Amino acid sequence: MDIYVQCLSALIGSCPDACVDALLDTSVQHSPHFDWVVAHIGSSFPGTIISRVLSCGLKDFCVHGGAGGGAGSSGGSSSQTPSTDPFPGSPAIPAEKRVPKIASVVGILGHLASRHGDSIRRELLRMFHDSLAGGSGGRSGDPSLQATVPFLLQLAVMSPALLGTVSGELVDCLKPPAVLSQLQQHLQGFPREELDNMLNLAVHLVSQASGAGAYRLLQFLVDTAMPASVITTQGLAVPDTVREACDRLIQLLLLHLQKLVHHRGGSPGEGVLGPPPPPRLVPFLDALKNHVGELCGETLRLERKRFLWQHQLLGLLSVYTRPSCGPEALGHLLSRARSPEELSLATQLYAGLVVSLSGLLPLAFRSCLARVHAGTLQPPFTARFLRNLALLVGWEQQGGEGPAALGAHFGESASAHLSDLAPLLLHPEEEVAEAAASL
Amino acid sequence: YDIPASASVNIGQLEHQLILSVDPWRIRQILIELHGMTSERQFWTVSNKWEVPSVYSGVILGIKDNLTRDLVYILMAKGLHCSTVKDFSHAKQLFAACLELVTEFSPKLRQVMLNEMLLLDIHTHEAGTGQAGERPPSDLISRVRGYLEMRLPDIPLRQVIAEECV
């Protein structure tokens, strides 16, 4: 009976014929009468292992889905555990298309838990076949992208609890993130405030140089991922590294080293990508594209070394993105700049952008002056910007080695942009009028 | 930071300094030390921003020695970028050191480099001397006249250079 039903299902899967429709209906009627989840799972498992590697069939798939739905309607915890075990044991062709075909919330949660356990065992055993099975289970869970945030949160909570298997669980979670492109990146960044950070520091202390290499790979993955809240991720990283807000000095040093490694990886990503092939999009960079201005705000707020780090980050971001955001960054920094150290920061980033690109001063002047003549750019900001230009053109009129090394030609740039400056002379704000008069 | 205790990030810092570098001798030292402490790999593909025209790129990449071809590649790319930025001082320095680099190499390559001399001198006299230049020294004028009147070997002439000198 069961063998005949499996043969009919395989024949329907191979040849699309209607000769197995009545047999499938009779099998579905017999299975509901039996009300055996174990028998339904047993009929589904050999049937899938045959007619998923043989050929795809709609009627056989519907019959297997009905049997799995009956098995899931029954309780069957041990049946679902043996069904998950037979599915990993026979991962032939559409095993992922068969196991995740239930599309139930409880079944998907159980499959995710079983895949997490299989991946943990794979990371513990360091076996290639077990790692491939765990990756297949993770890919099956990723295609069923209904709700994986609670499973990821449970996995992260379980990993920070231990110290011995914590490094292996973290490596398995990082590899699954490297395969699934870090879907819950914001959720991963948000929870580890101080206690998970201390637990991870203890786990890394218990780990070894292999753990250090895994941490470097995870830093590379985090740099090549996390488009959701790149600003929040960078703010969490920089306060824990430069501001020394981390609970452990070793954790702060590791954060600083990871920031340096991410900067180096982005720089190789920016430059060593290749001139003949098209460049690859960086999620972190094109997510910070919308928050370029606030990064300039932190840089002007001038932390210990975070301002240097964000200076390099803004430079590499400007090199990376195609409109190059150089006029925007220069205009924002000149608008909110008030002292020669920020002016020197402007000159240094200009030096980077002028050995990188061209047109920076004309683009910056048109952008900033258009924003001035618009409704934005409040009188204090524009007074600061105009008088910063006055200091720059004065320095370039003087200067003997500075402007000679960094020839910016502010004089010819503003001489091109003379025409719009007369309304700034007649501007009703006295400071704006004075700055325009000086310029 | 210096001495980063890892070869990969040391290479990254060194190539970042190489990109930032303007002195041709310092570029030569950095690239020769990188070739020493790495394998025989080309390193101009550490910066995709450096643009070379393909016609000159073929003959600049038709060099057997990876070190010499990488040195001359970075030199002419950085100098062409400086010429676009109108930085004729550093451009003249880089192209001069490229001249003493290519004098050992092929007459075809150094004749292309002499056409680069001609174009750089034209642009330098156009911008550095200003539009109010009262009189060219006419040595470069005689050089342009002689080059245009000879046009002899199979050097790939650039129409940009031709229209500039005309």
Mapped to the 3 state alphabet, what secondary structure does chain B carry?
Answer: CCCCCCHHHHHHHHHHHHHHCCCHHHHHHHHHHHHHHCCCCCCHHHCCCCCCCHHHHHHHCCCCCHHHHHHHHHHHHHHHHHHHCCCHHHHHHHHHHHHHHHCCCCHHHHHHHHHHHHHHHHHHHHHCCCCCCCCCCCHHHHHHHHHHHHCCCCCCCCHHHHHHHC
Spatial separation of the C-alpha atoms in residues A242 and A253, rounded to whole Å: 9
Spatial separation of the C-alpha atoms in residues A238 and A240, rounded to whole Å: 5
Spatial separation of the C-alpha atoms in residues A125 and A84, rounded to whole Å: 19
Compute the Cα dihedral for A339, A341, A345, A350 and give only its sign: positive
Spatial separation of the C-alpha atoms in residues A248 and B141, rounded to whole Å: 70
Spatial separation of the C-alpha atoms in residues A198 and A203, rounded to whole Å: 9
Spatial separation of the C-alpha atoms in residues A67 and B119, rounded to whole Å: 80
Q: Count interface pairs A-B at CB distance under 8 A.
A: 44
Kindly identify which residue of chain B lies nearest to residue A320, measuring between CA atoms: B49
Does the beta-carbon distance from A352 to B48 stay under 8 Å? no
Does the beta-carbon distance from A271 to B13 stay under 8 Å? no
Find where tokens 């739905």 sit: A69
- Other CB atoms within a 10 A radius of the CB of residue A145 amount to 9
Strand, helix or coil for residue A127: coil
Out of A273, A357, A358, name the one closest to residue B48 (CB): A273
- What is the C-alpha end-to-end distance of chain A, expressed in Å? 95
Q: How far lies A301's CA from each of A296, A305, A306, A338, B163, in Å?
A: 8, 11, 10, 11, 51
Spatial separation of the C-alpha atoms in residues A104 and A96, rounded to whole Å: 14
Burial-class residue B134 by CB neighbours within 10 Å (0-12, 13-18, 19+): exposed
Mapped to the 3 state alphabet, what secondary structure does A369-435 carry?
Answer: HHHHHCCCCCHHHHHHHHHHHHHHHHHHHCCCCHHHHCCCCHHHHHHHCCCCHHHHHCCCCHHHHHH
Spatial separation of the C-alpha atoms in residues A324 and A318, rounded to whole Å: 5
Strand, helix or coil for residue A50: helix
Out of B45, B49, B85, name the one closest to residue A319 (CB): B49
Q: Give the distance from residue A421's alpha carbon to the nearest chain B alpha carbon, in angstroms.
A: 26
Out of A260, A358, A407, name the one closest to residue B84 (CB): A358
Spatial separation of the C-alpha atoms in residues A64 and A67, rounded to whole Å: 5
Alpha helices in A74-208 (DSSP H): 77-84, 86-89, 95-98, 105-125, 128-141, 149-161, 166-180, 185-189, 195-206
Which run of H or of E encompasses B146? Answer: helix B139-150
- Other CB atoms within a 10 A radius of the CB of residue B33 amount to 12
- Chain-centre distance for alpha carbon A432: 43
- Asked whether the beta carbons of A97 and A46 are under 8 A apart, the reply is no
Which run of H or of E encompasses B79? Answer: helix B66-84
The letter for the amino acid at A94 is P
Six-digit token string for A176:
């699954």
- Asked whether the beta carbons of B103 and B81 are under 8 A apart, the reply is no
- Other CB atoms within a 10 A radius of the CB of residue A100 amount to 20
The letter for the amino acid at A198 is M
Six-digit token string for B115:
């056409």
The letter for the amino acid at B144 is V
Six-digit token string for A3:
């063998």
Spatial separation of the C-alpha atoms in residues A195 and A174, rounded to whole Å: 19
Kindly identify which residue of chain A lies nearest to residue B88, measuring between CA atoms: A407
- The resolution, in angstroms to one decimal, equals 4.6
Spatial separation of the C-alpha atoms in residues A404 and B53, rounded to whole Å: 29
Does the beta-carbon distance from A274 to B12 stay under 8 Å? no
Six-digit token string for A90:
């026979």
- Set of chain B residues whose Cβ sits within 8 Å of the Cβ of A319: 49
Closest to B8 measured CA to CA, from A263, A386, A135: A263
Out of B1, B16, B85, name the one closest to residue A267 (CB): B16
Spatial separation of the C-alpha atoms in residues B161 and B159, rounded to whole Å: 5
- Set of chain A residues whose Cβ sits within 8 Å of the Cβ of B87: 407
- Chain-centre distance for alpha carbon A88: 29
Q: How far lies A295's CA from each of A288, A317, A365, in Å?
A: 8, 11, 20
Q: Give the distance from residue B127's alpha carbon to the nearest chain A alpha carbon, in angstroms.
A: 12
Does the beta-carbon distance from A275 to B45 stay under 8 Å? yes
The letter for the amino acid at A342 is E
Spatial separation of the C-alpha atoms in residues A417 and A389, rounded to whole Å: 12
What is the radius of gyration, based on Cα positions, of chain B? 18
Closest to A203 measured CA to CA, from A244, A240, A259, A158: A158
Does the beta-carbon distance from B46 to A354 stay under 8 Å? no
Find where tokens 């300039």 sit: A296
Q: How was this structure determined?
A: cryo-EM
Six-digit token string for B139:
């040595």
Spatial separation of the C-alpha atoms in residues B32 and A224, rounded to whole Å: 31
- Asked whether the beta carbons of B72 and B63 are under 8 A apart, the reply is yes
Closest to B91 measured CA to CA, from B101, B77, B102, B104: B77
- Set of chain B residues whose Cβ sits within 8 Å of the Cβ of A271: 15, 19, 46-49
In the DSSP assignment, the letter for residue A291 is: G
Closest to A147 measured CA to CA, from A189, A104, A177: A104
Does the beta-carbon distance from B46 to A279 stay under 8 Å? no
Closest to A386 measured CA to CA, from A334, A325, A333: A334
- Asked whether the beta carbons of A6 and A46 are under 8 A apart, the reply is yes
The letter for the amino acid at A111 is H
Q: A148 Cβ partners below 8 Å, 6+ apart?
A: A112, A141, A142, A183, A184
- Set of chain A residues whose Cβ sits within 8 Å of the Cβ of B19: 271, 355
- Set of chain A residues whose Cβ sits within 8 Å of the Cβ of B9: 260-261, 264
Q: How far lies A265's CA from each of A17, A269, A353, in Å?
A: 56, 6, 19
Which region holds residue B136: left if phi is over 0, alpha if psi is between -120 and 50, else beta?
A: beta
- Other CB atoms within a 10 A radius of the CB of residue A373 amount to 13
Spatial separation of the C-alpha atoms in residues B140 and A10, rounded to whole Å: 86
- Asked whether the beta carbons of A95 and A87 are under 8 A apart, the reply is yes
Six-digit token string for A180:
């699934």
Angle at A237 between CA A234 and CA A241, to 5 degrees: 135
- Set of chain A residues whose Cβ sits within 8 Å of the Cβ of B49: 271, 275, 319, 356-357
User: What size, in residues, is chain A?
Assistant: 439
- Return phi, psi of residue A165, to 5°: -85, 0
